[PDB]
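Q: Okay, next protein. This is lysozyme from Homo sapiens. I've checked the sequence twice, so it should be correct. Can you predict the 3D structure?
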Amino acid sequence: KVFERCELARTLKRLGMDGYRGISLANWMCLAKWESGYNTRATNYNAGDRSTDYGIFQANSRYWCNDGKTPGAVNACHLSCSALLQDNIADAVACAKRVVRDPQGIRAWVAWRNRCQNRDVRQYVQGCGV
């Protein structure tokens, strides 16, 4: 499923992402936009290390979910990577919450540093009623 901007913003708020571990909703919106373009079925193969990024938040199969074909991988979210490809993003959200519980926080995603950090991210939630 490809979420519309405000539709996603309201969903994330309902799932308790606003201010989770100090991360504003606008930051989560900016992260999802640059990771998958709000596409829940987004998958990305990283030929260099044999891992694949799954879902709206592009969780890497080497650390977050299990796809069985990634060498020396862990499954910190304790989920099959298939779970991160559902139209329902509850699991993808629980896993993203898990990621930011580590010291790096929102920085765990390099895309966030490049496209969101130190920027005016208000535009992502403006007019959504969140």
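A: Here is a summary of the prediction. Strands lie at 43-46, 51-54, 59-60. The chain has one domain: 1-130.
Q: Noted. On to the next one.
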